[PDB]
Amino acid sequence: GAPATVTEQGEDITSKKDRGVLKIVKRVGNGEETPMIGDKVYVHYKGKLSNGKKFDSSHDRNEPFVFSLGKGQVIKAWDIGVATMKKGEICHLLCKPEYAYGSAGSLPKIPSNATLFFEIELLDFKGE
């Protein structure tokens, strides 16, 4: 399925080249501009654990998730991954725990040492 495909066929987007964040572009977005550090970014996403369980979805909340890019307001894999995206792009990310919640995990649903799968759509970005 999609998690296996990004694991086996994804591109390493880390600056360290350590395979910690792998990406596949599913829908090409608009133009050639990616967001700027500090921009307000608006995303829709779904996340799954490696046991197949959905652990989060913005779609189910009927509102996007909004954060400031490159500020550590989200897991490292998201700061790195969203920075690569164009407006309107949909991607898949496969995130090793060093770029996610590490040994701590995140209650209630994310265990220790968890590799995470996300589908992410970059809806918009704006400088403030």
Q: Is 117 a catalytic residue?
A: no
40 CB contacts (<8 Å, ≥6 apart)? 66, 67, 68, 69, 125, 126, 127, 128
Using CB under 5 A as the binding rule, whether residue 108 contacts Cl ion is answered as no
What's the count of helices (H) and strands (E) in the chain, helices before strands?
2, 7
Active-site residue flag, 39: no
Rounded to 5°, angle at Cα 44 from 127 and 63? 85
Q: How far is the CB of 117 from Cl ion (least distance, A)?
A: 9
**For the chain, what is the radius of gyration of the CA atoms?**
14
- When the beta carbons of 45 and 125 are compared against Cl ion, the nearer one is 45
Task: Select which of 24, 55, 65, 90 is catalytic.
Answer: 55
Clarify whether 56 is annotated catalytic: yes
By the criterion CB under 5 A, which residues form the site for Na ion? 5, 86
Shortest distance (Å) from residue 91 CB to Na ion: 7
Query: Quick check: helix, strand or coil at residue 41?
Result: strand
Catalytic pick among 13, 39, 99, 101: 101
Catalytic site positions:
45, 55-56, 75, 101, 118
